[PDB]
């Protein structure tokens, strides 16, 4: 399992453990469901770049204890 560091702006320690086979597609909606918000309302920023729905945990370079940010979009979902 790959445990990513999901530190919220409010200083919250969220441990999101994913796998290598899993698609980042479901990862995005799962986070939305966890926060109780519509899909595409939040944008994930990794090394400045935004995570796409067709992205994979294999590309870019994601490891254990990897720090990633997520902020609210302007679209509203």
């Amino acid at each position: 399992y790959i445990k990513l560091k999901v530190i919220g702006q409010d200083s919250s320690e969220i441990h999101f453990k994913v796998k290598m086979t899993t698609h980042l597609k479901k990862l995005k909606e799962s986070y939305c469901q966890r926060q109780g918000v519509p899909m595409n309302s939040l944008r994930f920023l990794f090394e400045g770049q935004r995570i796409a729905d067709n992205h994979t945990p294999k590309e870019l370079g994601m490891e254990e204890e990897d720090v990633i940010e997520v902020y609210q979009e302007q679209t509203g979902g």
């Binding site: 919250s12 320690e13 969220i14 086979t21 479901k26």
Partner: peptide, 12 residues
Amino acid sequence: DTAGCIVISDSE
């Protein structure tokens, strides 16, 4: 404090 643990299972 705040600790959140979520496990997701996704397969190709």
